[PDB]
Design a protein around this ligand. Structure first.
Ligand code: YMY
Ligand code: YMY
Lengths: 300, 300
């Protein structure tokens, strides 16, 4: 009774366009009279290993960017590069522009990805921005320019634009100002994300979700302290749990009648003992890509 | 690099309305000049255990159904009951009606759910129609009338409308002609689905997805036969694998260079030996809610 759920994608579907330079095609985001896309649309295959984007872009004029919205060509009347994104000014405001903002999301928070190819939406799924500033997505060639977002009220908060894949199979990208999350650069070389630490506060939120939904076998008669819990967290590359995290879990704690430090004692035992072939909310691993807010929103 | 992915929901978002009878509110699906909704909208709380729907509906007139599309009231000008759904004729065709059909989906196939409350979309996620004709969803009070669908071309194939929850926490509902999937009836009593068998062909498809995405530790030096594999399948409440299933897996077999019966030999060993703390595509359990088509569509 608890699922990984994406936001409804309609408001974002109406913003997706196709951008082509030469033989390179990817997706763009069309808001008001600007189309945002990854700057490596200007690269050929001989450019992708070590591109000099400033030099490559000087050779491009407005008419070298083909922007297609459905079957309709948009006229590009200006272009500029901002960090790792291009802004193509077009002669038509997108009539479907929703209320929106650009946000740079914090590690540990979640968002929905609308995967797109050739300017056409393909599917939607939820991701977390991991502590090492990667995401575990599903992206193929042609998917760059697909965006991540949250919806709050009628307002779309765009937080991610897709650019690349890492050797480990995870994904990296930018905010909508073109600044990468994490240490990555948009060149087609092997890059490291570092240790992929687990989002402790989210695992605890998901354990609360399990209790709400009737899965309680892992609850024990013990409690612990924050410092004692963190000694075990460290060994498993879990984020240190802070008092701020404990405060964020307060509402779930009161809803279930299970103190945060009692749930930490249960998590400690799960980390050290495993699940002994049992499952929690249909999973045999501890899930860390639901925030406390995600759990409350879903269970309400 | 492989995710549970729902279809983009925009085309369906535009069809969702709110239907109220008395104090009972749920969602309706507005296509052309008809609104489809679960018939238990006519029930009060004293009716839900053993409703006589024919007798309850005779007491209702067109003006007792309040249909709200956004902030706009629709005028109900006819009503009728078809199996477990009501069809409310309204005086306005939905201008956002997509190209659509109604399909009754086969067990083992997948679809996207647009979860809705008060006629407003809340989130989207993928489900399989399980062999015992239940789905593992996320639904609360107020969610009935939410629909499941596939998108093929520009055409929306509606296959599911949500009605109820079972004691085991799984979910049951109807096609858009109002006929339940499975043995269930729309009354608020404990009902059994029977043994929840695993969709063998889908597990094999997902193992092929894992190979495509670089996860190959479970491949062994053995092969097997269909009859020998099924002797082990039976013990684990797996669907018998048929030659028709083997044929459906043909394209994934050729894409990976792993014969179907070689992959069955790997699955056999996983079933008998477990995963020994290892994971496949980020899971510590064998996943059966991706069809062969889902895998091909995603990996393309
Ligand atoms: C969108 O244009 C595209 C999306 C990629 C393709 C495959 N999966 C994705 O998410 N992005 C790219 O092709 C970028 C473009 C450069 C200029 C940033 N290239 C990319 O993602 O490279 C993939 C790397 C994988 C790891 C490999 C080293 C392995 C030892 C090098 C390339
Ligand atoms: C939509 O109206 C609503 C959705 C339910 C509510 C909770 N989760 C859901 O999916 N459907 C209902 O309230 C139906 C209405 C009847 C008339 C079909 N009722 C329902 O789903 O009942 C839940 C059952 C759970 C198991 C319980 C027995 C446990 C020993 C009985 C009720």
């Amino acid at each position: 009774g608890f699922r990984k759920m994406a936001f409804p994608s309609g408001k974002v579907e109406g913003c997706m366009v196709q951008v082509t330079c030469g033989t390179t095609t990817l997706n763009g985001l069309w808001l008001d009279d600007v189309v945002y896309c990854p700057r490596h649309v200007i690269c050929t295959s001989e450019d992708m290993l070590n591109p000099n984007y400033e030099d490559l872009l000087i050779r491009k004029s407005n008419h070298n960017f083909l922007v297609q919205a459905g079957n309709v060509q948009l006229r590009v009347i200006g272009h500029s590069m901002q960090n790792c994104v291009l802004k193509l000014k077009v002669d038509t405001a997108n009539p479907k522009t929703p209320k929106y903002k650009f946000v740079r999301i914090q590690p540990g928070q979640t968002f929905s990805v609308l995967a797109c190819y050739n300017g056409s939406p393909s599917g939607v799924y939820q991701c977390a921005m991991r502590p090492n500033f990667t995401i575990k997505g599903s992206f193929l060639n042609g998917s760059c320019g697909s965006v991540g977002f949250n919806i709050d009220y009628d307002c779309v908060s765009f937080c991610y634009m897709h650019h690349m894949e890492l050797p480990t199979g995870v994904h990296a990208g930018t905010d909508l100002e073109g600044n990468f999350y994490g240490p990555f650069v948009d060149r087609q070389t092997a890059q490291a994300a570092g240790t992929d630490t687990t989002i402790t506060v989210n695992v605890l939120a998901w354990l609360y979700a399990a209790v709400i939904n009737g899965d309680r076998w892992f609850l024990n008669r013990f409690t612990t302290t924050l410092n004692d819990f963190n000694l075990v967290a460290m060994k498993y590359n879990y984020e240190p749990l802070t008092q701020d995290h404990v405060d964020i879990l307060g509402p779930l704690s009161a809803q279930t009648g299970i103190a945060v430090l009692d749930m930490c004692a249960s998590l400690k035992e799960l980390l050290q003992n495993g699940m002994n072939g049992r499952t929690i909310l249909g999973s045999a691993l501890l899930e860390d890509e639901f925030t406390p807010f995600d759990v409350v929103r879903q269970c309400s």
